[PDB]
Symmetry: D2
Subunit: 346 residues, 4 copies
Amino acid sequence: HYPTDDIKIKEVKELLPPIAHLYELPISKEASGLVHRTRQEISDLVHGRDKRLLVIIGPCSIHDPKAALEYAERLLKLRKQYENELLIVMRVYFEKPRTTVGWKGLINDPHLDGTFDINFGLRQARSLLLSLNNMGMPASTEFLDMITPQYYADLISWGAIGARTTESQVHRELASGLSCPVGFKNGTDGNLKIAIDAIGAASHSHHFLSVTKAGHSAIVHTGGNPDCHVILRGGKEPNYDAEHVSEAAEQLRAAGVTDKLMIDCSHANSRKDYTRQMEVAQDIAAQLEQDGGNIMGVMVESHLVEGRQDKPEVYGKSITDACIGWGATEELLALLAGANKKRMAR
Amino acid sequence: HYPTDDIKIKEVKELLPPIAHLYELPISKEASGLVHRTRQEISDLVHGRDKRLLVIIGPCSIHDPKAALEYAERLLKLRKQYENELLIVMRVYFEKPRTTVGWKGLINDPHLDGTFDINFGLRQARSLLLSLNNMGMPASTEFLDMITPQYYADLISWGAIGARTTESQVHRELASGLSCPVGFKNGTDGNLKIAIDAIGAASHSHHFLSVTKAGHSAIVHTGGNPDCHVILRGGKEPNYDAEHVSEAAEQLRAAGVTDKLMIDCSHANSRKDYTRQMEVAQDIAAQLEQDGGNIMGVMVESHLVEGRQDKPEVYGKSITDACIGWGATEELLALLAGANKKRMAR
Amino acid sequence: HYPTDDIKIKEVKELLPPIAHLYELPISKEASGLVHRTRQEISDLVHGRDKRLLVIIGPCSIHDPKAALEYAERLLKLRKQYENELLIVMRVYFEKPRTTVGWKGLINDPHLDGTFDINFGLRQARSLLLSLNNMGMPASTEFLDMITPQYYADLISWGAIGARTTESQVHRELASGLSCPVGFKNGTDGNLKIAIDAIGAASHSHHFLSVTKAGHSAIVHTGGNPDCHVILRGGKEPNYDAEHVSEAAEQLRAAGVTDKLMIDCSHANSRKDYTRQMEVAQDIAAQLEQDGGNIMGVMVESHLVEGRQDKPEVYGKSITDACIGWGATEELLALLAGANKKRMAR
Amino acid sequence: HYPTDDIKIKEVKELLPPIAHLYELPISKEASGLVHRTRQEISDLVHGRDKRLLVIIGPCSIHDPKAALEYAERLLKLRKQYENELLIVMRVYFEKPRTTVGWKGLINDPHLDGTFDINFGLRQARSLLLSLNNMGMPASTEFLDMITPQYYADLISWGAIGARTTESQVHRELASGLSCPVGFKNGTDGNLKIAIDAIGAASHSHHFLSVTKAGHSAIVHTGGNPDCHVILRGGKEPNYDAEHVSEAAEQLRAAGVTDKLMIDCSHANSRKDYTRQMEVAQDIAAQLEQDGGNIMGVMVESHLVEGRQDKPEVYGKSITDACIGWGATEELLALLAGANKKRMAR
Ligand SMILES: N[C@@H](Cc1ccc(O)cc1)C(=O)O
Ligand SMILES: N[C@@H](Cc1ccc(O)cc1)C(=O)O
Ligand SMILES: N[C@@H](Cc1ccc(O)cc1)C(=O)O
Ligand SMILES: N[C@@H](Cc1ccc(O)cc1)C(=O)O
Ligand SMILES: [Mn+2]
Ligand SMILES: [Mn+2]
Ligand SMILES: [Mn+2]
Ligand SMILES: [Mn+2]
């Protein structure tokens, strides 16, 4: 026969199934309680029942777990300190999607050297998330595929579907069966309709393909996710100001979905310049003081150290998108806490 | 000890692995030969080694195998008759992605009644593709997820990644290991950079998660797909005309990827009107007559009977997007054949 | 770094999982009814609620399914005719365990030429069992390992654990979770304790290692099989006469298990002389006339044609142990039917 | 559709696949060398190329790994002390086969409380075996089924098939693909032919059903095991003396298999009284000092503290068959080393 199968495949390696990771790193009672509780709390924010600000804040991507747990220990103090004004949740993204050839994230390539030790990667990803939850810091992440969630979704209190996948039917179907609340980002060029469309789609029951905990191909029948919302992350032009929030909210009401939204201070809203995250946060603060009824959260890309680097030389310094440092982070959260205390008190 | 896992999952059900369907419906010598040959012949059009026009043509979605087989028998005659000018490959899409609630396609819901007998669907799909190839008709389809291809990619001569997934990293990774040439559509609002980037991305080696033929979770390390191209399919504005082809070509050369492209006569370029497909085809024909050096194919939604219908009452009429009928198909193909006969003789 | 794993293994090949066979050959409504009620009917014989005689009768091993179906259609007329006196179930054994190099049975080597096409054999075995049941003929078999049952046990009305495996803990555990009544044979040298112990063991809950329907290693927690009994099949000397029955009954009563047993007319009771099966059946008929309260069934090795052959040249003639032909079978059943008519009438 | 499938199954639970354990506890360089060499050294005894006595000695069953490690540390000193005369390998059996309801072993029930935590049991079993090998004590075990060996056979230098399974075709097939040398015991009533038949059978190639390292059902094709021998373990009467050895040797040569055998000092050769293990060993000693040409090994049930316990209330005390203590073990080994010194020196 002429060959027709796997013509462009170098290798297919079997993967340790989720149950193997679950046996080594079973979720503890206290992590279980933190996740259940934070999921519910976030849901209240999504549907306008509590007026705290959800703050998803942390590195662009995790490239070292030691630095991440160190970051978490500082953030934990602010989480407790601002607990009446803000619901702080740590951003634990293992990979930034990239068009150009480059590092594929911590799950994919934990040794940062192109050896793609994914079993170790997933094991590390789960270990980190259990430790964070065990210390009192809830975690959030981006789900890029339909398989990785079986390894650690049980430890995630909030999920994101990125700008590049919000329109994708299979990612919407995934979101409809995710145990956590989910935010959908507007398209890379500013299209908001696709995120509005996605919350619609994700609240309904769907079927997609994936694997069981034991690692076998299966059909997943989901119940719908009622806790979805939009994230404004800019486009050609930023979309974070009051007028864009207003238009967005009107559109969400017309589609019959939640008009409470998140604003990303990073990415195309900061123009890929980390020193502008603070500008976006200040405008949001202004919005919260005047009115700001439709804002329920913000996203901030933050690290121990500011900026970015191509190689992982410097500890707690991003190797993907540039972040603000810890000093600026304390400044940003004091401000948001300050502004939302006034909103909550009106 | 609060629950955190599969909170919004109604059911998970095991799927028959690929090997079960490969065991019952193994590829034949003839089907292997046709797939292999057709994939090569198409790559030749992609890289400009041959100036025949690839015509991806057939129903919007397959909802009846008998009608598809009948359609194929008619198309076969014209595939042979035009074989020196056109490379005709049947469209065999099992689903049409959509945002609203509705029929999820032949793989997901073969009984067209909401039972989701996916084991049956996947079986019928492979059976139809094996039959089409055995009769002399090569097939093409859209790959919407990372698992379904293990079940029938071996029977597919050309693959599409739709507008909604072209920017998705995991779909680009998938394309990088598909055995067939792959077309990337421009975004739903007419964005071409995502498809140009996708070609660049898919030519490189990647890892993604999927399942082995035996249905177990796995790491797939791909080789890169050197045979990818863009498909112009409209957006806010149609992009089929000479001026758009030339803008696209310029952008492709500047990214250092192939400047040969496909034009979808349907969907947003026809504005969802099936009678405008013939208009787009004539415009393409006129370009091939004048120059048209960057056009390597077209896409046409065609069935035995023209139009569309909500319920599958009429034999051979679409229940998804509207199609041209057999009569206009004959004329479209005869038009494109003659226009390309001239381009070829230059 | 020395190799320590799989030193003496030539190949490990993956099987189609049971779900693959179950999907091609699902159990029909009618086959389900037959299996359900025959298991119940037999259970009534084991615990003494009904005085009909279970007759397990058919070839030593199946090597041709067509002969087995032709055998089955003749036997069916007799199953119907003697249904008030005899409960006739066909023997569908796929393999005779042996010590010397030879044919490994219809599952292991369905093509009978040493190519070990196990996927094909499991398929053929299931199809044969399905067709038998669909025609009205219940089936029985011997379970030699802990994995093959997942492929066809749903089609089996009565099971044997052979003389060579009755003492094996893992086989006793299997029996404890088999859906059918099970007969255990006495040891090759005549030891009855191992079968009495086996019945005891198998009535309890156990755990044993096996495979799920999807083919994954699993732990099976069984509930106990309350329907087990012994089979007197001879030893150094035959054990079929009234004295031996009576000694067995007492021992059975002493271990507090059912004192109804089965007598195998073949094997070491006939001493591998198929013409003696008739004399064993005549002894049993006499016991039934006189009393025989502890007999609930008999086993008989029977085919279309008598004797045995080394190669499968002659149609419907055994390639394992020698069987009685069809004419002698008619006599034997008539003999047993008439005798038990009088036992039942008392 | 009446139910016919799994009627008497309480629960099917997925088991961690072997690879999961092999990932947490990979074999080390040193353990590899110890396993590889010992297997070769045993092969040499089996085939008469060295006259050292193989000594399989250790607890009847392991129920505490701390005690097993302490026992091993003491045994190691003797292993080295007597290395020129004896090859001391540790008995590391996890379960003892039972007809009556009892503790089902360390693998099945590591917590000694009916929780059947088999994943943990298998993990513990592997861990113990890896530790033993790491400190320089090779290990030996009974293989009771066709799945457990995938989890630790790589750490085993000698395997036993017990009296209850020696006649079993599937265990013979298992043995034919085991990396270690294998001993087959004579039947529980003293039948030697089954063990002689077993060696014959196990030296040829076989197919049996099992699971891959990845935990999926598979067809195993073995190469044959050339290193099998019998074990004399008594029956209705003891079989350990010169005249039973002589007669066994004769039947062995006559069947064209190795006439070197092992004698079990325990079980039916001791009358199930641990105090008579020594009297058996004294007889073997006398045989060696006169001739003892056919003896290549002995088997001894020994522990730190002598005797049995109904429940595990004491350190280093058997909870299954009764074992001689350390004192009696020092004396037995001295006796054997001394007698065998004399055999080796002529
Ligand atoms: N386990 C995920 C949902 C999920 C289920 C099955 C899958 O295959 C994938 C994802 C959660 O609890 O959110
Ligand atoms: N088998 C596909 C490539 C592929 C391989 C593995 C997967 O999991 C998915 C897709 C092809 O030949 O095109
Ligand atoms: N399926 C078997 C019982 C069984 C279940 C699991 C196994 O792994 C083996 C046997 C029956 O219906 O009798
Ligand atoms: N792994 C075993 C042999 C074996 C192989 C496969 C199995 O499924 C079972 C046992 C050994 O090395 O001795
Ligand atoms: Mn980022
Ligand atoms: Mn369409
Ligand atoms: Mn027989
Ligand atoms: Mn013992």
